[PDB]
Scaffold this active site. Sequence first.
Site, PDB file in Angstrom:
ATOM      1  N   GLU A 127       0.806  -1.221   0.000  1.00 29.39           N
ATOM      2  CA  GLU A 127       0.000   0.000   0.000  1.00 29.39           C
ATOM      3  C   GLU A 127       0.840   1.272   0.000  1.00 29.39           C
ATOM      4  O   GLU A 127       0.339   2.336  -0.395  1.00 29.39           O
ATOM      5  CB  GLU A 127      -0.963   0.026   1.195  1.00 29.39           C
ATOM      6  CG  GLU A 127      -2.061  -1.039   1.169  1.00 29.39           C
ATOM      7  CD  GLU A 127      -3.061  -0.877   0.022  1.00 29.39           C
ATOM      8  OE1 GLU A 127      -3.055   0.170  -0.679  1.00 29.39           O
ATOM      9  OE2 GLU A 127      -3.871  -1.804  -0.171  1.00 29.39           O
ATOM     10  N   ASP A 156      -5.891   6.517  -5.155  1.00 30.82           N
ATOM     11  CA  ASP A 156      -5.421   5.135  -5.221  1.00 30.82           C
ATOM     12  C   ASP A 156      -5.410   4.613  -6.664  1.00 30.82           C
ATOM     13  O   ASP A 156      -5.609   5.383  -7.609  1.00 30.82           O
ATOM     14  CB  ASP A 156      -6.234   4.250  -4.249  1.00 30.82           C
ATOM     15  CG  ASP A 156      -7.667   3.999  -4.706  1.00 30.82           C
ATOM     16  OD1 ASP A 156      -8.057   4.373  -5.826  1.00 30.82           O
ATOM     17  OD2 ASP A 156      -8.442   3.408  -3.912  1.00 30.82           O
ATOM     18  N   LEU A 209      -8.722   4.309   2.518  1.00 30.99           N
ATOM     19  CA  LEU A 209      -9.701   4.887   1.615  1.00 30.99           C
ATOM     20  C   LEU A 209     -10.542   5.930   2.339  1.00 30.99           C
ATOM     21  O   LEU A 209     -11.111   5.643   3.404  1.00 30.99           O
ATOM     22  CB  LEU A 209     -10.593   3.789   1.033  1.00 30.99           C
ATOM     23  CG  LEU A 209     -11.720   4.247   0.117  1.00 30.99           C
ATOM     24  CD1 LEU A 209     -11.148   4.823  -1.168  1.00 30.99           C
ATOM     25  CD2 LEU A 209     -12.633   3.075  -0.204  1.00 30.99           C
ATOM     26  N   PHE A 218      -8.536  -6.175   2.469  1.00 31.92           N
ATOM     27  CA  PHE A 218      -8.100  -4.796   2.684  1.00 31.92           C
ATOM     28  C   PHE A 218      -8.157  -4.038   1.357  1.00 31.92           C
ATOM     29  O   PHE A 218      -8.614  -2.890   1.304  1.00 31.92           O
ATOM     30  CB  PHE A 218      -6.675  -4.804   3.246  1.00 31.92           C
ATOM     31  CG  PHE A 218      -6.186  -3.474   3.755  1.00 31.92           C
ATOM     32  CD1 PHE A 218      -6.225  -3.170   5.118  1.00 31.92           C
ATOM     33  CD2 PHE A 218      -5.607  -2.550   2.886  1.00 31.92           C
ATOM     34  CE1 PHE A 218      -5.727  -1.952   5.592  1.00 31.92           C
ATOM     35  CE2 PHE A 218      -5.114  -1.329   3.356  1.00 31.92           C
ATOM     36  CZ  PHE A 218      -5.186  -1.022   4.700  1.00 31.92           C
ATOM     37  N   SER A 220     -12.422 -19.527  -6.078  1.00 32.09           N
ATOM     38  CA  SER A 220     -11.068 -19.531  -5.519  1.00 32.09           C
ATOM     39  C   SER A 220     -11.110 -19.935  -4.051  1.00 32.09           C
ATOM     40  O   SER A 220     -10.299 -20.751  -3.593  1.00 32.09           O
ATOM     41  CB  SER A 220     -10.425 -18.141  -5.608  1.00 32.09           C
ATOM     42  OG  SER A 220     -10.411 -17.627  -6.924  1.00 32.09           O
ATOM     43  N   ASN A 279      -6.832 -20.026 -10.430  1.00 32.95           N
ATOM     44  CA  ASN A 279      -8.162 -19.440 -10.467  1.00 32.95           C
ATOM     45  C   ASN A 279      -8.134 -17.988  -9.983  1.00 32.95           C
ATOM     46  O   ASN A 279      -8.836 -17.133 -10.535  1.00 32.95           O
ATOM     47  CB  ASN A 279      -9.105 -20.275  -9.605  1.00 32.95           C
ATOM     48  CG  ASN A 279     -10.539 -19.872  -9.768  1.00 32.95           C
ATOM     49  OD1 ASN A 279     -11.098 -19.182  -8.917  1.00 32.95           O
ATOM     50  ND2 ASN A 279     -11.162 -20.304 -10.868  1.00 32.95           N
TER      51      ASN A 279
END
Length: 162
Positions: free
Chosen positions: A11, A20, A32, A104, A117, A132
Amino acid sequence: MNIFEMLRIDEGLRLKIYKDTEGYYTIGIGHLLTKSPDLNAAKSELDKAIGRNCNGVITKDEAEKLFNQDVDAAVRGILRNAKLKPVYDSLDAVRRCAAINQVFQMGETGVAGFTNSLRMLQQKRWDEAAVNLAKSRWYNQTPDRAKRVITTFRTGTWDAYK
Ligand SMILES: Cc1ccccc1O
């Protein structure tokens, strides 16, 4: 390595409001603020989050404080989610970090698209799961980060983070 160090790598750390990878106003370590294109709305969210008039700028300690809150809330959300908890609790601690990283980034609504998945992960079909996971908007938009997270899911090691 641990979830904090992992997310700090993925990040970054920026002390002024930035957009972002999706174009959304953000600050700190991937905090965010809003999906609204209104910068003023973003600044208001920031002030609300920090508890002072920040005028779009925070300190490292403040960034780290939001980060701790955000990581904690992500975990607590997983545990509250009937679709995510069983898969999460089936995993070893390193793979659980990959799970926290994914949520996240994309939120529980983003992980909702990963049902297939998640099934393969619960089955511990690690190579199949990894294949996948890469067949996704997620992977195509942030491939270098997704590659690291996927390697973590596939191996249960931290190899991708050094
Ligand atoms: C939230 C979550 C849980 C288990 C596996 C992946 C994932 O993103």
